Design a protein around this ligand. Structure first.
Ligand code: HEM
Length: 324
């Protein structure tokens, strides 16, 4: 097991303690680059496919890839398959160390910039509608860039299938199968450990998204996949209990209604609202159980909702902070 040392450490450390008595910030450090399944990936090209929007695409050259999304998944999967050196641009969400010097093709957060994309002379764009504008995606295709729209399932159960889908696009089915199986083994193993750590009465959680000290401050719902993360950590997602399907402003009324025990956040996002002290100034935060315990689990932004290959490790690291 790639997470074997971590699992052994967790099993040796005590969890008789009541996690409802823990206070303060817990921050999970960056997990780093995905370990590739091969050092000699040899894409079997060309590939013909029909993408998630119904577009027929031929992928004939994967030398210059733009793997773009909101969550940071595709760039990590591409590296896991053996093609990290082929990535020529990224969004702000693909924060993994291997891409730190790679050109960023989004502006103002997540807005696709056509000029930045086309100036990189990509041979393949892998993207989904988690980012836009849609019109920019259309412009890139119209400029002659092979563009493949994905629609990943983004559940823990589908980590392997989402990997296999990416692998098919780039003509690496064997690497896809290896990476899928490794990643699913790691998540199931993590879950066995999480189940041993969790309290009988699960912790109530919400995923709080922040960008700055103003109104970009949301409870994330079904569409963003945080339920999958929260339940993977042994929690109950209060957004799911309330039926939030997209996102909702994290105003005083919503926070009082949801009343989580833990806020799950992204670490750079938390910094952007002034850290835990800045968070505690926001209306309604301090009045929740989580606020009263200053209880925040901050996860590396570009891994937090990426799922993919490193999900198991994320769950183990995060659960250690919740329960040990
Ligand atoms: C759910 C997954 C998401 C992830 C992983 C993510 C990640 C990030 C990251 C890593 C940054 C970079 C901060 C920086 O510029 O230094 C950022 C910025 C930003 N995000 Fe997101 N984001 C997500 C969702 C959203 C959503 C739903 C919105 C708005 C509805 C949003 C709006 C912004 C804005 C406005 C910025 C710019 C902040 C700045 O100038 O620094 N993001 N995001």
């Amino acid at each position: 097991s790639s997470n074997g040392d971590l699992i052994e450490e967790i099993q040796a450390s005590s969890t008789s303690t009541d996690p409802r008595t823990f206070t303060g910030l817990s921050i999970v450090e960056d997990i780093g680059d995905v370990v590739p399944v091969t050092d000699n990936a040899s894409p079997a090209l060309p590939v013909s496919l029909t993408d998630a929007d119904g577009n027929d695409v031929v992928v004939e050259d994967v030398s210059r890839i733009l793997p773009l999304d909101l969550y940071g998944t595709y760039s990590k999967t591409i590296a896991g398959l053996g093609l990290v050196d082929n990535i020529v641009g990224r969004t702000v969400s693909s924060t993994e160390p291997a891409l730190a010097d790679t050109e960023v093709v989004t502006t103002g957060g997540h807005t696709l910039n056509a000029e930045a994309i086309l100036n990189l002379h990509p041979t393949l764009v892998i993207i989904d509608h988690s980012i836009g504008p849609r019109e920019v995606i259309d412009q890139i295709r119209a400029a002659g860039v092979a563009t493949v729209i994905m629609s990943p399932q983004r559940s823990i159960a589908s980590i392997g299938d989402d990997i296999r889908d990416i692998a098919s696009v780039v003509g690496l089915p064997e690497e896809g199968e290896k990476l899928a199986e490794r990643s699913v083994a790691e998540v199931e193993e993590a879950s066995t450990v999480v189940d041993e750590l969790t309290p009988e009465d699960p912790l109530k959680m919400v995923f709080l998204y922040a960008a700055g000290t103003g109104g970009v401050f949301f409870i994330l719902g079904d569409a963003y996949g945080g339920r999958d993360l929260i339940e993977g950590l042994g929690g109950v997602d209060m957004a799911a209990e309330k039926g939030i399907m997209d996102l909702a402003p994290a105003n005083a009324e919503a926070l009082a209604e949801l009343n989580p025990d833990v806020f799950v956040m992204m670490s750079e996002g938390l910094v952007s609202t002034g850290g835990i002290d800045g968070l505690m100034e926001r209306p309604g935060i301090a009045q929740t159980t989580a606020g009263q315990n200053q209880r925040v689990l901050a996860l590396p932004d570009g891994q937090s909702l990426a799922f993919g290959a490193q999900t198991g490790e994320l769950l183990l690291r995060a659960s250690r902070e919740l329960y040990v």
